[PDB]
Amino acid sequence: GSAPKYIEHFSKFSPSPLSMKQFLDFGSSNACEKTSFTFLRQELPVRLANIMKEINLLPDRVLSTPSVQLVQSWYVQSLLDIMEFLDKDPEDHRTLSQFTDALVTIRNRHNDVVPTMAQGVLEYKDTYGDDPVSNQNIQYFLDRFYLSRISIRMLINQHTLIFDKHIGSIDPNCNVSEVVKDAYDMAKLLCDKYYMASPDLEIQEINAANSKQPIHMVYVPSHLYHMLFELFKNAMRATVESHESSLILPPIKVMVALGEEDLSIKMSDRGGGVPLRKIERLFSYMYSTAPGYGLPISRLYAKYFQGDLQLFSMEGFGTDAVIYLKALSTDSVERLPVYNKSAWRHYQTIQEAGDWC
Amino acid sequence: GSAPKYIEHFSKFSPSPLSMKQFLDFGSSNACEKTSFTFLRQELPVRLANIMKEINLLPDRVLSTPSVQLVQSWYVQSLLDIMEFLDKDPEDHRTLSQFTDALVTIRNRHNDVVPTMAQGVLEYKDTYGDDPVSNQNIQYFLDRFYLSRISIRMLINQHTLIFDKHIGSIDPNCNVSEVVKDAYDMAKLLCDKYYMASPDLEIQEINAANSKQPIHMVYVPSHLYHMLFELFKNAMRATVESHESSLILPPIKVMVALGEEDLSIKMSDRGGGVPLRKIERLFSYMYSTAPGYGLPISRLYAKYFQGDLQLFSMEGFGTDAVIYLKALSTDSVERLPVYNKSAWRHYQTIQEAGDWC
């Protein structure tokens, strides 16, 4: 009967965003998991508490819903699961071992948070409606909640993966074009299965400072894969469906550019395009629910390390999707939400008559 | 001694946004200026009052500054200038005539609002600093103020121009590619004068529903010209300066696309590009002041009729600038700010510790 107490305690702390450089450190090749354990033992509780504190501070219907209250109950379990180690000591080649077992266990317990939280969104639509203010509140909360989750899973993955070339999920020499090819291959496979047709791929890179040298960077390849796969699938479907009465289906072109501080990936298709007004809704969780969240969540993966994901099409022609990542491991630092008085007022919207007419 | 009274009176009203279709009407070929006079006699005072009411409701230093207080005094004059007709009657081929003379007079009086207001921005920077909250407040206010002005000048221009093929400043058959060529020509001229070199132009259009038919639309050609000229100048300078040690300067490519609801113009250059972080500042009045406002104001002209202006580059390669306009005269309606309790709280920012860490 002490969950509320903990949440109240650790929510007083602020999570500590780590640089991509720091991850490499705590990962190294030998760096003892002892440091990780002592660190994670405090940080994880801090991150859980912050997001839980924010959850408990939103409309009672959103709280009383089976989904939100359900995932909330999952986080309560996990919080406790970790407290168990606060008064434990390393040295015991066991204390550490049972920690990972605990982390791995916490991971599977949360494996369905996205689909579940997504279920609450549909319930909300049917229960209260799809007004702009509701959209805003849900959008604001879900971006933070999901980003919070990405980071917690990040920490957990680095630890479990390392402690038993690549530093866990991080590749200090990730070749961007290669991940682009992989994501394309999978998308093509699925495209051929469903449409029995698929556009080809053209890749071009621009290494501003070193003309012919292949482009490499320090990054999490699975994160980049997820973003690119989502984009290829949309670009393929649009290209295919928009040319079902034509025969020349055009190719998807990708450009990978490496500048002084940005590493940019642009994906250009000729899938017909989308009016400007519908672009805005493509990133909304609410407006993209029925009767998926690939795009809004993909954008969160870009933002996680100070990047971004943007779209701009030309209705009647095609669409350009661009992923902006930080070129230097130095500028690559976790983007983490924090529960403040600042965050509180984003939920005080009492909309009813705008400033424009 | 009754200026405050009027402002208080007309600020209780909401301006009335007009469609591009309505402009054509009140413009027609014979439509009597009588209707215009009776309409403008009320609307103009309503628009002036709204913006003036908003001005009087911001920090005393911004008010006490010579610039803001100075333009504010210009608006006070103009408000009075028009009141003079509230108790006047048409029929008198004179009452109307002296109205235009009054409008034309009001126009010249405001001819330097931009440079002047821009002067207050620099003064503010030196007087109070360039903090994010100040930026926000200035950005919010200036976008509305300048948009308000664009509309007032619009009404005034339609009236003065018509009453003495084209319906004033509006061209019901504006050929987009043609305006693109004009804007390019002027920019090239200036480019050659200063740099003694300039990239060429390539134009391509995509008429989705009618393959080879030239693209036309109902619009204000001078508005479109201004936006395109600003973009060409930036694209030329970047292309030139980024290739001063090379010889192959590449061309600026423009695509004009006409879809079911959007008419889009994309301008692509290979001027080297800009990091993502600096893009955000290109639209800020504050962050773009020294020791111009082409971009932020150009964006306002796009937004005026429900359009937009966006930028996205690839650092180390180039930049795409896109102007989104409504394809149909039906969806082309004035975008006007209004003084509400809604607008009031955008100036209540008391920033000090964000929701992200």
Curated annotation (Swiss-Prot), chains A, B:
InterPro entries: AK/P_DHK_N_sf, BCDHK/PDK_N, BCKD/PDK, HATPase_C_sf, His_kinase_dom. The modification Phosphotyrosine is found at residues 194-195. Expressed in many tissues, with the highest level in heart and skeletal muscle, intermediate levels in brain, kidney, pancreas and liver, and low levels in placenta and lung. ATP binds at residues 230-237, 269, 288-289, 292-295. It holds the Pfam family HATPase_c. One of its GO terms (biological process) is regulation of calcium-mediated signaling. Activity is enhanced by binding to the pyruvate dehydrogenase subunit DLAT. Inhibited by ADP and pyruvate; these compounds interfere with DLAT binding and thereby inhibit kinase activity. Inhibited by dichloroacetate. Inhibited by AZD7545; this compound interferes with DLAT binding and thereby inhibits kinase activity. Homodimer, and heterodimer with PDK1. Interacts with the pyruvate dehydrogenase complex subunit DLAT, and is part of the multimeric pyruvate dehydrogenase complex that contains multiple copies of pyruvate dehydrogenase (E1), dihydrolipoamide acetyltransferase (DLAT, E2) and lipoamide dehydrogenase (DLD, E3). Keywords: ATP-binding, Kinase, Mitochondrion, Nucleotide-binding, Phosphoprotein, Transferase, Transit peptide. This is [Pyruvate dehydrogenase (acetyl-transferring)] kinase isozyme 2, mitochondrial. It comes from Homo sapiens. It catalyses: L-seryl-[pyruvate dehydrogenase E1 alpha subunit] + ATP = O-phospho-L-seryl-[pyruvate dehydrogenase E1 alpha subunit] + ADP + H(+).
